[PDB]
Design a protein around this ligand. Structure first.
Ligand SMILES: OC[C@H]1O[C@H](O[C@H]2[C@H](O)[C@@H](O)[C@@H](O[C@H]3[C@H](O)[C@@H](O)[C@@H](O[C@H]4[C@H](O)[C@@H](O)[C@@H](O[C@H]5[C@H](O)[C@@H](O)[C@@H](O[C@H]6[C@H](O)[C@@H](O)[C@@H](O[C@H]7[C@H](O)[C@@H](O)[C@H](O)O[C@@H]7CO)O[C@@H]6CO)O[C@@H]5CO)O[C@@H]4CO)O[C@@H]3CO)O[C@@H]2CO)[C@H](O)[C@@H](O)[C@@H]1O
Ligand SMILES: OC[C@H]1O[C@H](O[C@H]2[C@H](O)[C@@H](O)[C@@H](O[C@H]3[C@H](O)[C@@H](O)[C@@H](O[C@H]4[C@H](O)[C@@H](O)[C@@H](O)O[C@@H]4CO)O[C@@H]3CO)O[C@@H]2CO)[C@H](O)[C@@H](O)[C@@H]1O
Ligand SMILES: OC[C@H]1O[C@H](O[C@H]2[C@H](O)[C@@H](O)[C@@H](O[C@H]3[C@H](O)[C@@H](O)[C@@H](O[C@H]4[C@H](O)[C@@H](O)[C@@H](O)O[C@@H]4CO)O[C@@H]3CO)O[C@@H]2CO)[C@H](O)[C@@H](O)[C@@H]1O
Ligand SMILES: OC[C@H]1O[C@H](O[C@H]2[C@H](O)[C@@H](O)[C@@H](O[C@H]3[C@H](O)[C@@H](O)[C@@H](O)O[C@@H]3CO)O[C@@H]2CO)[C@H](O)[C@@H](O)[C@@H]1O
Ligand SMILES: [Ca+2]
Ligand SMILES: [Ca+2]
Ligand SMILES: [Ca+2]
Length: 686
């Protein structure tokens, strides 16, 4: 199958995601609607259930709404069973219409539908070449109060109907009991509750094994991807172990929700996206887009900086899920604003690197403040809006033009209000021009592109006041006027002679696992795949065609490898770096080091005898470790994903910048559990 196939669960870069807030999309089955105080058919009380369900989605898939838009993937509310409690938050009734208050990760939310309904959804979607992504929030169960168990459902957790435990009398310690987070520190945000939500304790073997078993059920149900909620609030080490569980079973494209504010650039965020085993929702991208196109708080130079910076900060920038708004921020379109702002932001996003996601209703110019005013029922299913047609014209390009899906990004023309950027992949090119200035046209002269000589029609057909482009030799464009609020797209595709890797996924797995290598110019006959210097050919290459390769990871030592391929003739491709071969199945282990005193600015890290521990290289050490919540300084702790059943040697380090102080004495030793969790407690050796 080709890289663009709906069967490709490892690569969403050629897709366009449509984010669906299930309850607010389409009530296809009134029979499953909640009743009484938990319900409002009119959807006037946005904190109640409105009736939107999976049948509705199926209907909207079958009637051409999504497909007509060029949508090729959907991201839906967390499908798992939520609490049925109607929570009164100071005079206002609230329901789990949003799906984020889980009670049983192995059952469905009856308001959305049954397991049978879910299967029907998967089938209907797939039949229409639409991939299905589910929100998954293993961070917590639901709102709770230990002192008052009668509040809500006391964050109770069930296992396919079997009560595991609740927030009150949590003898098992399934949850954390460290109060609520104040978002002051990462550690604080991880080991304390989000709001009043019962924080799951992933160091608890039951919880760990349960959640990993739960996701398997959904993977078995045929999901094509996962949107991990509140990833900044779960141990990064545990999440890597979760991603390993997924990847070592049935790998599916996964991205986490890690909020970033205006002008916020987080190295931690980058590191997470770079080493966790999942990508992220591109908040950096979205916030900048809003500043430039919506709020006018930065100009095209800021947009360009974000593009160049992000391309350098993210190992796999093409896996980042972009967007212009969502269920947690005001809707992009301000009721009083000019619609061209939203249309341009849309066009920009659809043609930019990464994986574009469109919040349901954006195409209908929905306006709304913060939660829940931004979660109103989609008021129309009209295909006649300008925004609908924009998506309709550009979405398909991600499929037909690999430059848009995998291409680099380069600024070709720029001023305060104008940005003309180029996407390039192999023999494929796309040039996009955007003039944010709604009042002033710009004179474009001196534009140089990689487009071959010729005349290029605006892919938008002038919908956004675009124009035709005339390119001479050397890729020089004839002078032209970029209309006020003008947005244009010119593109060119052609066969690529040299094997060119555009994408690889998953990016972290143990040997034997099958990975997907997408691009162009691979040729029809099997070639060779390289994991570092190790060459793989023949049988272990399950399938090989021009745009996609399926190959099993060879049994090489755990570590980070550069992936490369060569066609049957021996011609090598570019290198796709950062591939992590695990040392085997993973388990999440908590490392605790006692009496490790330090100086302000200097932190304790963990290093060990396996790649998961950085193989004794302090530059690849795990940390910095935590010392505030679960354990207090001078005791440090951290949750780490390590190879199950392996006997591992380790030591702790103190680091100040790049300067490192090693523990004295002999290495510590322990053997990782074969499944579940473990806590290794040792003293700092001077
Ligand atoms: O020994 C003393 C005492 O200890 C214990 O009590 C402590 C609690 O254990 C502890 O959790 C802590 O809770 C307090 C919070 O720290 C504090 O913030 C406050 O919480 C308020 C909150 O401040 C309010 O804003 C309000 O929250 C609203 C949100 O503002 C809304 O936006 C909305 O939200 C929900 C969204 O609608 C959902 O979509 C979803 O969000 C998801 C995102 O959409 C998604 O993108 C992302 O991926 O994931 C998100 C999460 O899944 O969920 C959101 C959260 O539900 O709705 C909420 C809720 O109305 O209300 C809360 C609660 O009033 O107050 C908390 C209570 O004090 O501090 C306690 C005291 O120290 C014991 O429990 C107790 O018995 C003991 O007496
Ligand atoms: O934003 C969160 C913080 O995260 C990082 O802070 C780290 C420090 O870099 C570590 O050095 C360590 O801090 C220890 C400190 O090393 C230790 O000496 C002790 O600090 C005393 C200190 O001796 C005394 O002079 C006075 O300042 O009181 C301090 C508090 O007792 O204890 C510290 C831990 O409490 O750990 C923290 C993480 O907790 C980051 O570098 C910081 O910017 C940031 O604040
Ligand atoms: O592959 C080569 C070798 O790899 C393995 O060695 C590991 C060790 O097992 C780790 O302990 C670590 O070594 C640290 C050491 O723990 C630390 O004390 C420090 O050693 C200093 C020492 O304190 C000081 O007294 C003096 O002797 O200098 C030493 C440094 O040379 O620093 C060590 C790291 O530099 O890391 C190494 C790998 O680097 C394996 O055990 C070996 O068999 C193998 O040869
Ligand atoms: O080798 C020629 C020339 O190439 C490169 O310049 C290009 C700029 O990088 C690119 O921004 C664009 O420049 C336009 C400005 O963006 C715009 O504001 C206005 O000033 O017109 C410019 C074009 O006339 O195009 C040029 C190429 O024409 C390279 O950066 C230069 O060093 C080099 O001289
Ligand atoms: Ca319904
Ligand atoms: Ca947590
Ligand atoms: Ca890379």
């Amino acid at each position: 199958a080709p890289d663009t196939s709906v069967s490709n669960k490892q690569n969403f870069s050629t897709d366009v995601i449509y984010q669906i807030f299930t309850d607010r999309f389409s009530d296809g089955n009134p029979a499953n609607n909640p009743t009484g105080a938990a319900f409002d058919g009119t959807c006037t009380n946005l904190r109640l259930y409105c009736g939107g369900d999976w049948q509705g989605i199926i209907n909207k898939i079958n009637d051409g709404y999504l497909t007509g838009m060029g949508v090729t993937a959907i991201w839906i509310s967390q499908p798992v069973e939520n609490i049925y409690s109607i929570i009164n938050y100071s005079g206002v009734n609230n329901t789990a219409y949003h799906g984020y208050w889980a009670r049983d990760f192995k059952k469905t939310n009856p308001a959305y539908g049954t397991i049978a309904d879910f299967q029907n959804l998967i089938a209907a979607a797939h039949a229409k070449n639409i991939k299905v992504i589910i929100d998954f929030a293993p961070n917590h169960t639901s709102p709770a109060s230990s002192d008052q168990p009668s509040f809500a459902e006391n964050g109770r957790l069930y296992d396919n109907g079997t009560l595991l435990g609740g927030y009150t009398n949590d003898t098992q310690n399934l949850f954390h009991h460290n109060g609520g987070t104040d978002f002051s520190t990462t550690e604080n945000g991880i080991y304390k509750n989000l709001y009043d939500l019962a924080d799951l304790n992933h160091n608890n073997s039951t919880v760990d094994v349960y959640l990993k078993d739960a996701i398997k059920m959904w993977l078995d149900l045929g999901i094509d991807g996962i949107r991990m909620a509140a990833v900044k609030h779960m141990p990064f080490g545990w999440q890597k172990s979760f991603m390993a569980a997924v990847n070592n079973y049935k790998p599916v494209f996964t991205f986490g929700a890690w909020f970033l504010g205006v002008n916020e650039v987080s190295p931690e965020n980058h590191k997470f996206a770079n080493e966790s085993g999942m990508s992220l929702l591109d908040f950096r991208f979205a916030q900048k887009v809003r500043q430039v196109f919506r709020d006018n708080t930065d100009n095209m130079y800021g947009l360009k900086a974000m593009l160049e910076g992000s391309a350098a900060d993210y190992a796999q920038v093409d896996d980042q899920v972009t967007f212009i708004d969502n269920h947690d921020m005001e809707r992009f379109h301000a009721s009083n604003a000019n619609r061209r702002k939203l249309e341009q932001a849309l066009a920009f996003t659809l043609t930019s690197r990464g994986v574009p996601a469109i919040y349901y209703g954006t195409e209908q110019y929905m306006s709304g403040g913060t939660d829940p005013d931004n979660r109103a029922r989609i008021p129309s299913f009209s295909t006649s809006t300008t925004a609908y047609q924009v998506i309709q014209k550009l979405a398909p390009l991600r499929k037909s033009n690999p430059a848009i899906a995998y291409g680099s990004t380069q600024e070709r023309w720029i001023n305060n209000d104008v940005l003309i950027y180029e996407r390039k992949f192999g023999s494929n090119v796309a040039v996009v021009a955007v003039n944010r200035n709604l009042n002033a046209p710009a004179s474009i002269s001196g534009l140089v592109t990689s487009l071959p000589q010729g005349s290029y029609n605006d892919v938008l057909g002038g919908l956004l006041n675009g124009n035709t482009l005339s390119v001479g030799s050397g890729g020089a464009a004839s002078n032209f006027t970029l209309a006020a609020g003008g947005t244009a797209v010119w593109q060119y595709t052609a066969a690529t002679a040299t094997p060119t890797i555009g994408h690889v996924g998953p990016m972290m797995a143990k040997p034997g696992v099958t990975i997907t290598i997408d691009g162009r110019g691979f040729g029809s006959s099997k070639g060779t795949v390289y994991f570092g210097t190790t060459a793989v050919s023949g049988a272990d290459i399950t399938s090989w065609e021009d745009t996609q390769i399926k190959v099993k990871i060879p049994a090489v030592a755990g570590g980070n490898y550069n992936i490369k391929v060569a066609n049957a003739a021996g011609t090598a491709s570019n290198v796709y770096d950062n591939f992590e071969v695990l040392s085997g199945d993973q388990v999440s282990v908590r490392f605790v080091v006692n009496n490790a005193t330090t100086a302000l600015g200097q932190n304790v890290y963990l290093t060990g005898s396996v790649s998961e521990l950085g193989n004794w290289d302090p530059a690849k050490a795990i940390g910095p470790m935590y010392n505030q919540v679960v354990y207090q300084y001078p005791n440090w702790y951290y949750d780490v994903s390590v190879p199950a059943g392996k006997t591992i040697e380790f030591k702790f380090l103190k680091k100040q910048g790049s300067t490192v102080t090693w523990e004295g004495g002999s290495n510590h030793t322990f053997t990782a559990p074969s499944s579940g969790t473990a806590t290794i407690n040792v003293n700092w050796q001077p």
